[PDB]
Amino acid sequence: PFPLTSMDKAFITVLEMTPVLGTEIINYRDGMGRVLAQDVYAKDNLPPFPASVKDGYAVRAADGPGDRFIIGESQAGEQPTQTVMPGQVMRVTTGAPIPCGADAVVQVEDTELIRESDDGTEELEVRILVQARPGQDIRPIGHDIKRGECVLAKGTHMGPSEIGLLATVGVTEVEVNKFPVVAVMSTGNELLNPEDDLLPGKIRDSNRSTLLATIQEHGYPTINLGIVGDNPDDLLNALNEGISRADVIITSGGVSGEKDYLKQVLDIDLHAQIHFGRVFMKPGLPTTFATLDIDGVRKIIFALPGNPVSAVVTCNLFVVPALRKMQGILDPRPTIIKARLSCDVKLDPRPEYHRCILTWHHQEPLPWAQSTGMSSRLMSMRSANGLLMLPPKTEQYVELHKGEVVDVMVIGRL
Amino acid sequence: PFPLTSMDKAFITVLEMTPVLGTEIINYRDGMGRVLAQDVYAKDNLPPFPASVKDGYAVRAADGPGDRFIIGESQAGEQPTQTVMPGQVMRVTTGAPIPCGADAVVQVEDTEELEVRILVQARPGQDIRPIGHDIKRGECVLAKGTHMGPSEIGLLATVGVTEVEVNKFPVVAVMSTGNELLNPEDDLLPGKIRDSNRSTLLATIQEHGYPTINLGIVGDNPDDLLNALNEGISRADVIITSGGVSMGEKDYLKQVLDIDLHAQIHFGRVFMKPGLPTTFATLDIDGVRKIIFALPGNPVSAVVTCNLFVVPALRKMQGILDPRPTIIKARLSCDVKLDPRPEYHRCILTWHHQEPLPWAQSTGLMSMRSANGLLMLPPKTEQYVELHKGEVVDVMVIGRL
């Protein structure tokens, strides 16, 4: 029917054929995970005024060490109204501006009080131990951020600090790439909803919840199309609904002779284009990837296998990277890390992928990757952390032994 | 004023003094990140019927290779009505039930349609999931304490358990204190700057998926602090504040916590960099324990401290058995002198081609990529005055790799 595709080729094909979505304007507070479609320029200096590093005293560095009059305190959030003449200081706290006349700051701990008024006990006089080089313990204007400079560049994938940066420079509206809306369905006449009691020959639909949760983890919005009957009429309806509401349509299950109603509907009815229908991998050989160009917009379509392990594995190898590209990330490829194999395993001729748990043991450089294999059985208090990427069988590698360095793909925030 | 606390002690103190929240019943579809407060038992076998692995034919293994009659197909959703006699097969698809009489399955590639030549050499049980292969009826599929991800939700879906008891999520209220702060939306005024910590903190705790409450900017004075803290306290489990002064008597916050709220302050300074001026307190109200953090105004301190102290505490509130962060070994990208205080740098983690350890690049620098970890520098000692590029160091993971 469809040629066996190399795992390398399937993955490359998925990224090339996956489009980058366009952009939209959002409020900074919604920037989490968004990629900036613009440079962001700072319109003020930070700090805007010279600011003390320490809690202490603003001094003249020509005066050197000695006894000084305290004229006042520099209040937080005010422009200082006094000015410092020789033989004078002003008390400062850490956020505070430096008054004109001072060129340096000295900590409280490098001083000792001489006099206090004791009519309300304000300080009058300070002995200033120490000599301070000019500039000492001051953030001059524009120390951290210089006016007009590019604080964040186009292509930047934002996290909490980046949002803080937007907040800092006053840029509360920003143009970012869109997030893919992702629609998910399950196909199969054997499937019942999770809420239903089992009936003869039937099982509960688990993939729909697993996939929606997976895509949710990355924070893209999703659409639940539910269970769909394995037949042209019912498929064409759900796909059309998925297509009008979403950028990505994902389906799990369905059969693949002439009962491949899905591949048949994609080709005949929707005139989609199917780039591959089988891939030389384990699990997930029966995976299908297609694109459909509608009104210039390109929607993308994945048909993953019914097997629950295949569904989650394929979702992570193919779907997430594609979604990452749609959202505007410059390298959407996953992080692959070296780890040490916890348990012996025979190799398949197909490259194989095992859900595994990553643990960094104290003072050991590499993490240990413990394969789950397996639907249940292997019980860890901890969610599967990565995909163990086993190589294909060769004559020099019939099996792999505990301790050997292997590639693990990181899946999900630890 | 308040004693300098060792970083080891501040962290231990935060975990001990942080309570675990109680539990509540949720729908499986909302399980992401929740910890199970119960064991979950499977009430059916999976598969419930013997199921074919391959698309192919169900056969008798006593009949070896040969020519066979095809009696029918086993439909996906249905109990098979026919039975397999010697010299017969039934067409099967993947996940379809096996009919009575067959003990093995053979792929299409090892071969309406009337007859099939079967190339075989097949052993009994071959390419069949017997009843209860994956899940056996009545067995514990997920244990109490399990911290759920998409697979776990799938497992709940599989075994029919759509309602489940989990620990609550902490509601976290955030404010900024300081007379110099304006909202991000405002234009600057003399002596004033924009409030950046409120957004950074709310976004951070949002990343972990706990609900938050924005109390906004609060004036640095007893009246205005007591109101916000009270509002935070009545609406939230955690109250976080950024900024405020702690020189002499202008520490209106520590003064309000002690005098007005009769909170208990476990530490007010910690021997670390950044974030020396950090404060942690608990307040026992009506038997419930609320927890309060006052982080430093410095934006770098805020995000560093939030990650070292707050997130772990929130993880515990949420019922996680080890709420401590993952620390990984990495290779130092840039030389650095050591401070006497243990220091913490926001850094980016990159795993380079075929190299076993990731490289940790301190921000101290316009990466396209959000800061991935906290570089945990050690404290200065006589044998470690500085650290050089290439040396193995501890990095704490703070977001998605």
Binding site: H362 | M7, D8, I327, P378, P379, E391
Partner: peptide
């Protein structure tokens, strides 16, 4: 587990 930075001998 320790929350203060460590050197690797």
């Amino acid at each position: 587990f320790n929350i203060v930075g460590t050197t690797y001998p």
